[PDB]
Amino acid sequence: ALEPLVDLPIGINITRFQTLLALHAAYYVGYL
Amino acid sequence: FELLHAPATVCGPKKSTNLVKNKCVNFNFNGLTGTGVLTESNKKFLPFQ
């Protein structure tokens, strides 16, 4: 199961997102 | 002041009152409105719940 952390009353209108790794490890995405 | 279809942010404090138990009372709880007798419980609730 998956339990909430955060709500935000921003007003933004997002269309596309991008991750950000770090340097001195795969990752999965999926849609709803 | 300005109003928008986006969520509002500025409201008055919406002050509270004291607590009344075991007596048939009206009640408002953050928005949930009803009437009844409200008593001390022993259930187990999650923090978000």
Swiss-Prot record, chain A:
Glycosites: N13
Effect of N13Q: Increased resistance to neutralizing antibodies
Encoding gene per record: S
Quaternary structure (record): Binds to host ACE2. RBD also interacts with the N-linked glycan on 'Asn-90' of ACE2. Cleavage of S generates a polybasic C-terminal sequence on S1 that binds to host Neuropilin-1 (NRP1) and Neuropilin-2 (NRP2) receptors. Interacts with host integrin alpha-5/beta-1 (ITGA5:ITGB1) and with ACE2 in complex with integrin alpha-5/beta-1 (ITGA5:ITGB1). May interact via cytoplasmic c-terminus with M protein. May interact (via N-terminus) with host bilirubin and biliverdin, thereby preventing antibody binding to the SARS-CoV-2 spike NTD via an allosteric mechanism.
Stated consequence of mutating A1V: In strain: 20A.EU1
Protein name: Spike protein S1
Organism: Severe acute respiratory syndrome coronavirus 2
Superkingdom of the source species: Viruses
Role of this protein: Attaches the virion to the cell membrane by interacting with host receptor, initiating the infection. The major receptor is host ACE2. When S2/S2' has been cleaved, binding to the receptor triggers direct fusion at the cell membrane. When S2/S2' has not been cleaved, binding to the receptor results in internalization of the virus by endocytosis using host TFRC and GRM2 and leading to fusion of the virion membrane with the host endosomal membrane. Alternatively, may use NRP1/NRP2 and integrin as entry receptors.
Whole-protein residues included: 222 to 270 of 1273
